Each structure stands twice: as C-alpha cells, then as structure tokens.
Amino acid sequence: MSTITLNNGFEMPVIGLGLWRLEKEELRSAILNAIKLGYRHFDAAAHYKTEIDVGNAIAEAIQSGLVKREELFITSKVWNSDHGHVVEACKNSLKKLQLDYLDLYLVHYPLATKHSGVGTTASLLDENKVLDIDVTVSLETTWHDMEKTVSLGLVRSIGLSNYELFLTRDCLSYAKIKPQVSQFETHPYFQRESLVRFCKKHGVVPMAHTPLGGATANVKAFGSISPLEDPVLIGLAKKYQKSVAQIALRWNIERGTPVIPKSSKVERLKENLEVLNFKLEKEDIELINTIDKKFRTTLPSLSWGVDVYA
Amino acid sequence: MSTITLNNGFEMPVIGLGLWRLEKEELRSAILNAIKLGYRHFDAAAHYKTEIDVGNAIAEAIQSGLVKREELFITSKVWNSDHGHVVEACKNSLKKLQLDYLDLYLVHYPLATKHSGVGTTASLLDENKVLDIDVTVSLETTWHDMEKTVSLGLVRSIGLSNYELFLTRDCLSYAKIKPQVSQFETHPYFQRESLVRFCKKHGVVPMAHTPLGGFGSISPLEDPVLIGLAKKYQKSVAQIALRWNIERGTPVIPKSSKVERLKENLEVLNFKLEKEDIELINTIDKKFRTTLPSLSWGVDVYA
C-alpha cells in the first residue's frame, strides 16, 4: 500500500515530490514526469513563489489525461507574513494553483512576521535589517484560522511545518481540529526519534522534508556533510541493490514517516517512487538508527538577520 | 550599577546565586555566606525539592539582621507537573519558603506533564517509560495563571525558563502582562545572540542560567581565548565568562558554595571588559548546550 491514513480519514501518499527550489522549465518537466511515473503527492508553498507554475503543470497533466484532480494530494503552506491573514492567504493559494480545495495546508513556520500583502509573501526587515518578527498574532490564533479553512471547505487537512516538541504539544492542547500532519526536517543524520514518536503517539503523521539531508545527485564542491555518504548506508545500498537515497527514504517510510524528496531527474524520480517496492529488514533499520548526528541542514536565509534556532 | 530595571519598574540584581544541586548544610551555609558577602538574588525552584531549606536559611539571615526581606530578590519556578495548578503551586512554594511574596516566578519549562500532586512535583512516565507529556493545558493558559499570581499579590514579576525564540514570541503575542524575564542556558560556548537580542528588543531581560557552561568533559573556561583574557585582566576565567554576559545586559546566576568563588563571582561587578575583548569572546561560540533534562524522562525535548 502506498498511502497512510490521516486522523480525519483521508489517505495521503507516503512518497511526495518536494517542490522547494524547482522553478520554470525544470519545475514543469519535474511535475509532468513525476505524474507519469506515478507520483500523486506534491508539496508546494506560497513563499516558493511558484504556485502559478505548479498550478499550470498540474492543469496540463489533468487536461492531457495523465491524472484526475481527485487522485492528487496537493499541499501548500501559509507564510510567516500571513499568520494574521490565513483565510485570505489560503484563498490566494487556491487561486494561483487553479484548485477548488487543498488536500493539506500547513503553517510554514511557527513564526509570525510583518504582513506584506495577500499573495505577495515576504520576509520583511526592520530598521536594523533584522527580521520584522510580529508580537501580536499568537500561533493559536493562526491555528484557529487554519481550522476555519477546513470549516469553509477550502482545505481537507491542516498541519504544522517546522514545529518541534514544545510547539507541537502546545498545538495539541489548544486545537479543536487536531493537526493531521507535522512536517519537519528529519533523515538518517537528524533522526529526531523523540519528536517522531511523540507525533505518532497523538495520531499526528510526521512527515520528513529534506529527507536526504544535505544530499543531491550533482557534482559539487567539498564541504557538505550528508547521510548518503555514510558507510552504513553505502553498505546497505549494495546489500539491497538500491541507491543510498532509496535506503534513506525507506528508513523513514518504515517508521511511518512519509517523505517528500526533491528531484527533477527522471531516473531519480523513478528510484524514489520505487521505495514503495522493497522493505528494509528489522536489523538494518536498527543499524541505521545508530548513525544519528542530530545535524540540522535546512535553515532560513542568513538575510533574516536572526537565527530562529538560537 | 548592581541591578537592572525590569519592564515593570522593579530592580533585579544582575548577579544571583543559582541554587540547583545545593542541599542540606552546604545549601544553608552557601546562602548565609552569599548574603554576608553581598548577594541579594537567589534562584530557587519547587522541583529542586529544597524550598523548605532555602526558606529556613533566608529566615535565619533576616532574623540575624544580615539583610531585610525588601533587599532580597527571591525567584522560584512552577514545575512541568503543575501547569494546570499554577496558583496552588505558587502558594505551596510561598508556604515552603516562608515568604509572603516572590520577586520572580518562572515557568520552569515550556512543557506540561502529568500532575503528581501540589508540593510533590515529579516527572511521571507512561506505560513505556516515556515522559507522560500532557496535551490538555496550553502554555497560554499557564501564562494567564502566572498573571493571576501577580493579580493576587503572590508574585511581583513573572517570566519564562527554557523558552526559545518561537515560544517567547508566542508569549509576547498573547500576554496581558509581558514577561519581565526569560531565563535560559547561555554562556561563551552557547551565546544565543539572536535570542538575547530578541528578548531585549521587546523589553524582556534575558538571564543566563548555567552561565559558566560545562570520560573527560568540555568547558568554555578552558578555551584559550578566555584563559588569555583572564591573564590580561588579572581575573579568573570564570570572572571573564560572567562579565561577558553582564556586558550584554544578561544577568547571571552562577552556582557555588565555596566562599572564595562566591566572592569572586560577586566582584564581577567591579571591572569591565573592553569592546575588542568582548568581540574576541563572541568569536568562540560553539552553540553547545550543556544543561539537559534527566535521561530518565525517556524523551529528548530538544529533538
């Protein structure tokens, strides 16, 4: 089976295509190729500034008969600048994506910043070139407006992005609609066992963005540490006759954590989706568990002038 | 200038004695010796299980004329198991400490766990030996009850412990009484500049617990930069580390029983670091967290 049941009954594909940093012709080809290969889950966001292009690619695929809307699981996210404008931000995402509903809508960060206009998300700086962090809209107020997007019928499922244990426990304690999903960076070098286990205990599906850590299949410069170069994963890739990326992705799937790897290259798109077609043995899961480095690789731009993980 | 003005007008001594892991005769003597040397700020907590002994030492000090209550700044904290029983927990701390009011009352962690009885705080475990974390009381509900301890006259100033940027921004956005203080681990190997600056921007005084940092082991007091500055200023490395936090408006609560160390820590008020030397220390940040909850919780809250 290729899906996981969310706590409101909807089925979510456990492999999705992460769309962060895909643009223009590469974005169009990636989405079309992915749908042709069998991808049914696409992870977008307002602040990627690509929702119109994502919508155009999905529209082409539907109009060409490659897939039906109801077969797709489409996610977007409300940016930090719209924590006080959730419903209108949601309507704007739907307009740009050419959709009547979203399958999943996430709070992109547990952080409100100065509003910059609906549909024109931004990370505005103050007089000292420091992120203009808002201190008027609570995360709970934002969450209750996420609940409104559900009651309005704009969104089926709602959830969190980049929330950790304290913030997730807080959400559970004030939520009227419990989050369906909590998405955050996790992979074999940042395993976050306690956070994953806590989400699952309370019926929240944890979802791994950045599920390969720093890693890409490109030729690159020295000085970028990644779980895919770990000898443990290299050995397991040889054992299973899989790529190291496939081993890393399957490790998250084995613990009930869907993955949204990013890729435009058809060979790799195909390999990542074929993670559905093998299983890791128990002892090999336990071997991968030993290589955690507690190593965070997905960070906000230095241009914020604030380390939110300080 | 031995105090900093909180956003509600009360003065707080920038050097305090942290009482974590002091008990029995060591605790009583440390408090009496600290007061005699000039300490006026004492950082207690319900979950340290020592409030009765802390209160007895403070009472003895006042009774002997060493100090008056109004000259002392006393802090306690509500434990994770009491996030739904804040006023009861506060009155219990006041009873054990033999005080009529607290100067400062902190939420010990941004985490609620299963209630274990007022005055008998604990970190309870579920069926699989994992911390029994509560999902019914919000941090905002706890905060409004911290505000109620102020309304009732039990507490002058209220604040946060072990909250970081996302949680502190959230508190500021729903608080009716803005927190006076945010206390967290910070020292030259875990400088957290963005968090310190954010607190200060919004009128919250950041306060450094674990201000000296950390077989074998690791410590900022062993960094060649601090060792060199110690010789340059003719101070101890610990004094350099403490002064560095004081220089950026971040009070410190070092823990210590030995009179010689108590005295040296308080004399941090008697010298200043030059701008260029502060900048030298700023270069040695390691983002290195050393103060962690017990492994017996079975959960890494910083996961």
What residue ranges do the domains of chain B occupy? 1-303
Q: Give me Rg for the CA atoms of chain B.
A: 19
Q: Phi/psi at A288 (nearest 5 deg)?
A: -65, -35
- Work out whether the CA dihedral A98, A99, A104, A107 comes out positive or negative: positive
Given CB atoms, is A176 within the 8 Å cutoff of chain B?
no
Where do we find the tokens 């914020």? Answer: A304
CB-based contact A261:A17 (threshold 8 Å): yes
Helical axes A282-289 vs A231-240, angle rounded to 10°? 160
Q: How was this structure determined?
A: X-ray
Within 10 Å of residue B135's Cβ, how many Cβ atoms? 18
Q: Name the residue in chain B with its Cα closest to that of A190.
A: B303
For chain A, strand residue ranges (E) read 3-5, 11-13, 17-18, 41-43, 73-78, 102-107, 155-161, 181-185, 205-209
Q: Which residues of A touch B166 (CB under 8 A)?
A: 110-111, 139, 167, 308
Residue appearing with tokens 């899989």: A242
Kindly state the helix (H) or strand (E) to which residue A88 belongs, with its residue range: helix A86-97
* Interface contact B133-A198, CB threshold 8 A: yes
Contact B198 A306 (CB under 8 A): yes
The helix/strand/coil state of A12 is strand
State whether the Cα torsion B206-B207-B210-B211 is positive or negative: positive
Ramachandran sector of residue A91 (left: φ over 0; alpha: ψ -120 to 50; beta: rest): alpha
By CB neighbour count within 10 A (0-12 exposed, 13-18 middle, 19+ buried), where does A84 fall?
A: middle
Look-up: residue for tokens 């005699």?
B36
- Cβ B183 vs Cβ B252: under 8 Å: no
- B21-28: long-range pairs with CB below 8 Å, 24+: B21/B48, B21/B255, B22/B50, B22/B255, B22/B257, B23/B50, B23/B53, B24/B53, B26/B257, B27/B53, B27/B54, B27/B57, B27/B257, B28/B53, B28/B56, B28/B57, B28/B60
Q: Does A130 touch chain B (CB under 8 A)?
A: yes
Per the rule left: phi > 0, alpha: psi between -120 and 50, beta: everything else, B67 is: beta
Q: Are strands B155-161 and B11-13 parallel, antiparallel or unpaired?
A: unpaired
d(CA B244, CA B242): 5
Q: Where are the alpha helices (DSSP H) in A189-230?
A: 193-201
CA distance A195 to A294: 12
Q: Which residues of chain A does B138 touch, with a Cβ-Cβ cutoff of 8 Å?
A: 140, 170, 173-174
Intra-chain end-to-end CA distance of chain B, in Å: 40
Angle between helices B165-174 and B139-151 (to 10 degrees): 50
Chain B residue with Cα closest to A133 = B169
H or E stretch including A56?
helix A51-63
Contacts of B22 (CB under 8 A, 6+ apart): B30, B50, B255, B257
Tokens of A18: 């992460």
Give the burial string for B22-48 (b: 16+ CB within 10 Å, else e): beeeebbebbbbbbeeebbbbbbbbbb
What does the block give as tokens for A279? 């299983």
Q: How far is CA A128 from the centre of its chain?
A: 32
Give yes or no for A110 touching B (CB within 8 A).
Answer: yes
Residues in chain B: 303
User: From the CA of B110, how many Å to the nearest CA of chain A?
Assistant: 6
φ, ψ of residue A50 in degrees (nearest 5): -125, 10
Which candidate, B82, B225, B75, B220, places its Cα nearest to that of B157? B75
Beta carbons of B135 and A173 less than 8 Å apart: yes
> Which residues in chain A have Cβ-Cβ distances shorter than 8 Å to B164?
309-310
Helices (H), ranges, B189-255: 193-201, 224-233, 237-247
Q: How far is B170 from chain A (nearest CA, A)?
A: 5
Q: What is the DSSP letter of A33?
A: H
DSSP β-bridge partners for residue B15: B252
Tokens describing residue A177: 């609609």
How many Cβ atoms are within 10 Å of A21's Cβ, its own excluded? Answer: 12
Per the DSSP assignment, residues forming a β-bridge with A107 are: A78, A160
Instruction: Tell me whether residue A108 is annotated as binding.
Output: yes
Q: Which residues of A29-38 are buried (b: 16+ CB within 10 A; e: fewer)?
A: ebbbbbbeee
Distances (CA, A) of B32 to A83, A84, B35, B59: 51, 52, 5, 10
Nearest to A101 by CA among A63, A144, A62, A158: A158
In B, which residues are within 8 Å of A164 by CB distance?
302-303
A191 to chain B: nearest residue by CA? B303
DSSP assignment, residue B127? T
Kindly list the catalytic residues of B.
48
Q: What is the DSSP letter of A275?
A: G
Can you tell me the distance from the alpha carbon of A120 to that of A122, in angstroms, rounded to the nearest whole number? Answer: 7
Within an 8 Å CB–CB cutoff, is residue B146 touching chain A? Answer: no
Q: Which two three-digit tokens encode residue A206?
A: 């944890």
Q: What residues contact A38, with CB distance under 8 A and at least 6 apart?
A: A273
**End-to-end alpha carbon distance in chain A:** 40
- Contact present, A92 and A133 (Cβ < 8 Å): no
Residue A183 DSSP code: E
Please state, in angstroms and rounded to a whole number, the distance separating the CA atoms of residues B11 and A58: 61
> Is A15 exposed, middle or buried, given 0-12, 13-18 or 19+ CB atoms closer than 10 A?
buried
Residue B169 to residue B186: CA distance in whole angstroms: 18
